[PDB]
Ligand binder design. Sequence first.
Ligand SMILES: Nc1nc2c(ncn2[C@@H]2O[C@H](COP(=O)(O)OP(=O)(O)O)[C@@H](O)[C@H]2O)c(=O)[nH]1
Ligand SMILES: c1ccc2c(Cn3ccnc3)c[nH]c2c1
Ligand SMILES: [Mg+2]
Length: 170
Amino acid sequence: GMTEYKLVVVGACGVGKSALTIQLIQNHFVDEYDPTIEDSYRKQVVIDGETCLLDILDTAGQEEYSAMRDQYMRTGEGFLCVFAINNTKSFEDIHHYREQIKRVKDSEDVPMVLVGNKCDLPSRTVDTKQAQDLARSYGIPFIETSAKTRQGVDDAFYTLVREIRKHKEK
Ligand SMILES: Nc1nc2c(ncn2[C@@H]2O[C@H](COP(=O)(O)OP(=O)(O)O)[C@@H](O)[C@H]2O)c(=O)[nH]1
Ligand SMILES: c1ccc2c(Cn3ccnc3)c[nH]c2c1
Ligand SMILES: [Mg+2]
């Protein structure tokens, strides 16, 4: 089979994980999607000439059993860590997601991309500089996105695939 990249989208409730995923898969903005639904989605794409499958888990937070969270973190190859640029708490929550994924995977080398979503809004509490400072400390890419306009969406997901490829070559 063609290569499949297992991607996981994490971040506080309300940041736009479902809207980003639906824009990536369906190329539509869905402005209302039940915050409590967690599901996977698939898309066959071409990234840098490689025909591959993106198998994306759109997370929704706590699970019935914490073993389910640990399972998807171990299964996932790369993580989109999403905050919203007008929600400081969602940005502070990135520290928890970064820690938890490394902790579960028991790894100091986990492919991740920091995503600052809702960049179409002038209303902002997290400046680009502050998010760049955090991504610099993690040694990962940072991309500002808008699930509404689709700005940065393919970049965020395709960059994560490229980070997974760099990890595999070691
Ligand atoms: N303006 C704007 N609103 C967005 C964007 N992405 C998501 N939203 C809105 O943010 C809210 C939460 O989005 P949702 O995808 O449910 O977030 P989730 O809880 O992380 O899955 C909804 O009201 C969406 O319409 C975006 O890029 N721009
Ligand atoms: C990454 C990590 C895990 C999954 C699953 C499995 N899964 C878990 C909950 N719902 C579905 C499918 N695609 C994935 C991509
Ligand atoms: Mg959601």
